[PDB]
Amino acid sequence: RNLRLLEKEVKNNKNSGFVHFNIGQEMNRLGNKKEALKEFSEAFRLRDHNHYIWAKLSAYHIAELLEQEKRYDESLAIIEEARVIWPNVPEFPLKKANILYVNHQLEDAKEIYQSLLENAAIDYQPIVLYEATNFMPHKMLGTIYLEEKDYTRAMTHFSKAYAENSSDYGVMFQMIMLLSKFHQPKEIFAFMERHHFISSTETGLRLLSMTTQQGYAELSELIVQSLTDVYPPVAEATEVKIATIRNVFPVISESAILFGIKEELIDAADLCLWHYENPQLPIENVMKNSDVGDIYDFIFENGPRISKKRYLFVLERAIALGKGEFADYLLALRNVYHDSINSHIADLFFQYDFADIALDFYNIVDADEVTKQGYINLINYLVDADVLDEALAIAERGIDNFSTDFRFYLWAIKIDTENRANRISEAMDEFPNNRYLAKLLDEVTMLQ
C-alpha cells in the first residue's frame, strides 16, 4: 500500500530523486535487494544538490547492497566517491574498514578504525543512528587486536566499546572469553561486577548461556549465585549445567529441562550429552517434541545421518566442555560422512587448543579438502614449532589455492626472510592498494 502510493507518485514525477529514494527504502523493507540498488542508484543520480541527507544515505545503501553481494571492488568505488563528496560522514570510512576486515586486511582496517576515533580534524556527523558512532570502531579494533594476540589493547578497546553500548553481549562475551585465558574466575567476576555486566537477572541468564557453553564452571557459579529470585526450575537447569562441566552425574527434572530450553540455556548438544551420561532422563521424549529427534536417532539409535553442521555442533560442545569420552563416542560416527568431514574436525580441535589431536586429523585430509582456517592453523603450528621451511611451504599452498586471500601472502612475507623484497612485491601484485604492504617495503629499504 505504501509502495503503491510511491509508484503512482513516480509515474507523474520521474525526475525526483527523493521519490526514487523512498522506493528504494520500500524495496529494502521487502528484501528486493536487486530493485533497491537500482532505485537508490537512481536517487543518487537525480539529486539536485549534494547537501540532501537522503543523497548521502543513497550512496551508503548502494555501498551496503554491493557489500552484501560481495561486490567489494564496486562497493569501495562507491565509498571513495562518496567520501570525496561528503568528507564528514563516518559511515563511509567505517564501511571501507569493514570490507578490509572481512577481506583479511587487518592493518589497513585498523588504520581506518583508529582515525575514526577522537578525530580533532574531521567533525564527523553520522547519517544513521543504529549504533553509537564510536561503538563499532572500538569493537572492531578490539577484534583485530585479539586476533593479533595483543590482549591488552583488545581489552582496552573492548571495554570502551562496552562503555558506548553496555547491552551488547558480543563485546561482553569477548572480554569474558579473553580474560578466562589468563585470570582466575573470581578476578573475572570482580571485573564483571565493577563494570556492571549483570544489569538484571535476564542479562545474567544470557551471560550464563555463554559461560556454561565454554566450560567456565566456577565463573558460571559466581554469576548464577549473584542473581536474585531466579525462577527455581531455571536455577536447577543452570546448576546442572555447571555440575556437568565438573563431571557430576547429571540429575535434572523434566520441568528444569523445559525451562532451561525456554531460557536458551539448554540446546540439543546438552540433551545429547546428558542422555549419554544419564539414560534415565526423559531426553528422548524431550528431543522428539522439539524437532531434533533425528539428532537423537543418529547419535544413539543408528538412525539416518544428520547434516554435518549439526553433528559438528554436538561434537563441538563435547570438545569445549572437555567431555572426551563422549567426544570419542561422537568421533566414531564420522565414518558415515565424506572424508572431508575430518577437515572440520581438525579445525574444531585446533580452535579449542588441541593442536596435537588436530594434526592427526589434518593428516587424514587431502590437501584439496583443507579449509583456509586449516592452512592458517598449520602455518601457526609450524611457526610455533620452528619448522619455518614447512611453514612457508603451506603458505605457498595457500597462495596458489586461495589466490585472493591476503593472509597467505603476509605469511609468505613474514617467513621467507631471505626473500622479503620479492614476497612483498608478489603480494602487491594481488593487492595493489594495500597500504601495509607499502609500509613493509619501506621497512626493507630501511634495513637494506
Numbering used by the authors: 183 to 630
Give the published text.
Based on the expression, purification, crystallization and X-ray diffraction screens of various GmaR constructs, we determined the crystal structure of an N-terminally truncated GmaR protein (GmaR141-637; residues 141–637), which contains GmaR residues 183–630 in the C-terminal part without the N-terminal glycosyltransferase domain. The GmaR141-637 protein in the apo form (GmaRApo) adopts an all α-helical structure with 27 α-helices (α1–α27) that are laterally stacked from the N-terminal α1 helix to the C-terminal α27 helix into a curved shape. GmaRApo is segmented into three domains (TPR, linker and antirepressor domains in order from the N-terminus to the C-terminus) and folds into a tertiary structure that resembles a duck swim ring. The N-terminal one-third of the TPR domain corresponding to the α1-α6 helices forms the vertically protruding head of the duck swim ring-like structure, and the remaining C-terminal part of GmaRApo corresponding to the α7-α27 helices assembles into a circle at the base of this structure. The N-terminal TPR domain of GmaRApo forms a twisted semicircle using 14 α-helices (α1–α14). The TPR domain contains four tetratricopeptide repeats (TPRs; α2-α3, α4-α5, α6-α7 and α8-α9 helices), each of which adopts the canonical HTH structure of the TPR. The TPR domain is connected to the antirepressor domain via a four-helix bundle structure (α15-α18) in the linker domain. The antirepressor domain consists of 9 antiparallel α-helices (α19-α27) and forms a curved HTH repeat structure. The circularly enclosed conformation of GmaRApo is stabilized through an intramolecular interdomain interaction between the TPR and antirepressor domains. The interdomain interaction is primarily hydrophilic with eight hydrogen bonds and salt bridges.
In L. monocytogenes, flagellar expression is transcriptionally coordinated in a temperature-dependent manner by the motility gene repressor MogR and the antirepressor GmaR.
